[PDB]
């Protein structure tokens, strides 16, 4: 959480961070892209077959 | 400073929150996954 990590529990700081805009969103877009592919990495390795033998 | 005691300051605003939803074109109903918590705050 890039609003929480930068400005802890602070309204005055969080209002200043919102002037920086998409920075907080683009970091999580890359971390989510990792979180999605890490479940995809596990999906590609351990499940190659539809049937559980 | 008045009576002598040691108070830990624990930050508020704790635990992850996720949004489980179908596309807004489908429905506006959402499920909210609260990580790191039991069912209490809501
Ligand atoms: C200050 O307040 C504390 C309680 O918070 C009390 O124990 C202490 O005696 C007070 N000191 C004076 C002299 O006001
Ligand atoms: C919303 O769903 C309808 C019905 O399936 C579809 O015709 C339309 O293209 C969708 N619009 C958007 C913005 O996804
Ligand atoms: C929540 O607490 C109950 C006991 O009150 C426990 O059985 C349950 O597993 C807990 N759930 C979580 C959040 O792990």
UniProtKB/Swiss-Prot annotation, chain B:
Annotated glycosylation sites:
25, 38
Q: Report which superkingdom the organism of origin falls in.
A: Viruses
* Effect seen on changing residue 36 to G: Increase of pseudotyped VSV particle production ex vivo. Increase of viral load in hamster upper respiratory tract
General function of this protein: Attaches the virion to the cell membrane by interacting with host receptor, initiating the infection. The major receptor is host ACE2. When S2/S2' has been cleaved, binding to the receptor triggers direct fusion at the cell membrane. When S2/S2' has not been cleaved, binding to the receptor results in internalization of the virus by endocytosis using host TFRC and GRM2 and leading to fusion of the virion membrane with the host endosomal membrane. Alternatively, may use NRP1/NRP2 and integrin as entry receptors.
| UniProt subunit comment | Binds to host ACE2. RBD also interacts with the N-linked glycan on 'Asn-90' of ACE2. Cleavage of S generates a polybasic C-terminal sequence on S1 that binds to host Neuropilin-1 (NRP1) and Neuropilin-2 (NRP2) receptors. Interacts with host integrin alpha-5/beta-1 (ITGA5:ITGB1) and with ACE2 in complex with integrin alpha-5/beta-1 (ITGA5:ITGB1). May interact via cytoplasmic c-terminus with M protein. May interact (via N-terminus) with host bilirubin and biliverdin, thereby preventing antibody binding to the SARS-CoV-2 spike NTD via an allosteric mechanism.
Q: What is this protein called?
A: Spike protein S1
Organism of derivation: Severe acute respiratory syndrome coronavirus 2
